[PDB]
């Protein structure tokens, strides 16, 4: 029974600890975009609708589909879950996380599939060559808030999952899109942070 | 003898999480009402509208026989409360993804949930160009189930029973025609196969 | 009962959910006041009020003697904690469907409920200026109980919904509100809903 | 005597529903603080200003004696914890309406509160007529409590001996006259009579 | 093998609530540091920026002992749980008073907290320009408890020597000074005395 399987995982948990045994934690990353919404130069900055493609493995969410009902994934709430805190370093001008949210998709395995939509806000840059076919980078800086490369790190989700996969033609371009490993120690806080930043070409299409 | 003895019977047992099912397969009859055309900017390039979105389909867990209840067969019970749809509107959302009011869902005895939430949508479109007071645009509307797949739910198109232009205060451009159809994909990032329903629409202005 | 032992007497075994009669069909009594025309706007064609949105109606659990609490009459209690209905503004609500503030409401030992939640609404006009008319009217309704289960008269319009009426840049010279009753093809029952329509002529 | 166990002591049986105090007419102290003028924009001719709501009053259930506790006495707790004034803007608000943030208040062992919350209003004003100067402008403010009338709840004003002016930073455009005043009314909507404050400020121009 | 055996425990038997101190005046030490300028209006009326506020005090009760983990303990807490310092932004404007995301806490078998949360503030200063590219702009930011004095609690400055400007992304234009600087004051509101740190900005249209 379905109902049997939830109360079976969800009973003990803290979603508030991280998932494992003892360190550390590695989350599959990648963005996937499904439109480029708007970029004005007025405001140079850039609005995105994005597909933020996460998986990473809880083991306190593992069982044997044999046991009951033979069911071998359930979707589930990311609320009632742990979920990495990933943010957009580039300047939300709304909003940092993933705010919708949606359900996970959790396998026996102990494995979490969550790929939550957002729109974000992000500030851009502009290169100068021509009047009409002009140029800008536009970059996307995503990583964990909280939880360094001790803790958690990621593992770039391999542009193979396609970065432009979905993405209707709007007005511009993206023709370059660059996923790029980080890490850094910020002048702040002693731990060293890994995260993904993104490079985006948009060229003014006529 | 009074419907809170049927409130308590019915969610006493349930669980929102799980599908409403037996064994396999929810089907979705799926309908677009559109109380209004907001606005149609183009700086932005997106389109506002005021919609409603008719769902329609069974609950299992949800079904009794009257006679228990009473000689009424109906009862309005909290979108909060039942498992609902996840459907979101994939294109864009500058106000929101999912309908966000939520309103009740009437629930027939016969297990049969039907939601019907109003909402603004804030859309993306490929809007226009100056072309005289004569330009006309499709701007579609792309919904779809955001985590359950064709397996585990699916969209039927409503007769369009819910109508989608009887109730329409005109106020600001066009909707003359405006065409939903089914489609069905795989997308990189899943190994399943969901369905959506996207609507497309016409505009005019007044010339 | 000690003054706390009559919130807690009528809201232990109480239910939100559930329509609060004995039978069928919960009336309510429904008035719009206009305390101001917010903007009214030409180009985007849409009027934004600050209203009041009058409720009354009779909720049959929430009753009590009393004698048996203090001589004090009736009280205040949050709206959250018993069913209010759904009204909402059909109407391009663009900001806010429904009165999000939310007040408490006075509830009388005699089971009345007098809610009136101040909203803020952005709302849908017609044709604007130039000589100069406009709609702008604005039509509300419970959203999913219809006539069967509940259904609406009128405050009348006698008691004035403009006292309150503070005036802006435009007018609102003659604003009536008139009942309807109709079928939606998405539903197969019959819903009630009260328009009020307004006319501003910006009036030098 | 444990400072998280005398949290304990008061919060146990405390009802946040409830008026407190066991008899009749809770008298809210009430004045209203501005620390600056945000925005003047003429054409909605509304007016932008970041106050604060001096709101003071008396809990019958909230007394405690310092001299049994040890650090001892008259701490700070979380407003959403006990009863507070619903205290609502009449005039605008197309942010707020309320204080919607909302801050912690702080209590004293006398069963005294203090509330002071920050609040964004916008609020619309008047540019009179003509022999008032064209470039000045009367704004006013008028504050109340929304569902309790003066048998139930009332308004004293703290005096403007409390300075509206002292966190107010001199901004781009001036504030002269501040004058907060007492009103009470019977309203065609609700048999009873609500008191409020109302605010009238006067400010010119000169840049 | 558990940090449940280590989060359980730790929380169980807390309060958010009250100060986190067995003697008086718990220490902030509290920071800034500019991700990005996102824009100064406008004209009208304000200024926005992408912040981080470096916070760190100490909560005792936040105490255990390491061996009782394995050898590095200090693990990422949930804000919500623990008692976290009410600083608002005094001016704000359109936008939001204090920390609205919120992220985690960093906690140390210490009882040493660092909470470093994002945040997007708008908030005027003043209007600016009056000048071609080379009009200059004094926006302050003035950071402070709201609810607790210097008795209840205090902020240290944290040293700029940790970075307020190294992730300075370029955006748009200017932002080419800061100071940060230590106030205390007494407010004719409120009884005690209020200390906060302002922070002075000058941002040049970029060349
Ligand atoms: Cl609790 C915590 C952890 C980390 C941080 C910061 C350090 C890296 C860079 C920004 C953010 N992540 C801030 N707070
Ligand atoms: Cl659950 C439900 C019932 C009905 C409806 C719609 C039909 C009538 C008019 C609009 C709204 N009310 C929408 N949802
Ligand atoms: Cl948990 C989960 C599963 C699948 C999906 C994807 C399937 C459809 C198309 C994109 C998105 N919605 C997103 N999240
Ligand atoms: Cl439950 C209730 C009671 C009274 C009121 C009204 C009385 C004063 C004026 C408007 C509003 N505030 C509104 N709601
Ligand atoms: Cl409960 C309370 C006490 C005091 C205050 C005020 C004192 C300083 C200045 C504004 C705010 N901080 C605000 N709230």
């Given at each position: ?19 494992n045994?003892?360190?550390?934690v ?38 044997n ?26 300047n ?13 998709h ?101």
């Amino acid at each position: 029974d379905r109902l049997f399987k939830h109360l079976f995982r969800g009973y003990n948990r803290w979603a508030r600890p991280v998932p494992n045994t003892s360190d550390v934690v590695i989350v599959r990353f990648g963005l996937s975009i499904a439109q480029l919404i708007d970029v004005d130069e007025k405001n140079q900055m850039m609005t995105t609708n994005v597909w933020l493609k996460q998986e990473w493995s809880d083991y306190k969410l593992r069982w044997n589909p044999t046991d009951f009902g033979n069911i071998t994934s359930l979707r589930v709430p990311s609320e009632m879950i742990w979920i990495p805190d990933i943010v957009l370093y580039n300047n939300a001008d709304g909003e940092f996380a993933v705010t919708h949210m949606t359900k996970a998709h959790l396998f026996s395995t102990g494995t979490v599939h969550w790929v939550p939509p957002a729109i974000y806000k992000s500030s851009c840059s502009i290169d100068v060559t021509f009047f009409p076919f002009d140029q800008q980078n536009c970059k996307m800086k995503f990583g964990s808030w909280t939880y360094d490369k001790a803790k958690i790190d990621l593992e770039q989700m391999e542009q193979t999952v396609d970065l432009k996969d979905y993405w209707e033609s709007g007005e511009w371009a993206i023709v370059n899109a660059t996923g790029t490993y980080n890490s850094k120690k910020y002048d702040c806080c002693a731990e060293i942070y890994p995260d993904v930043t993104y490079a985006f070409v948009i060229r003014r299409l006529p």
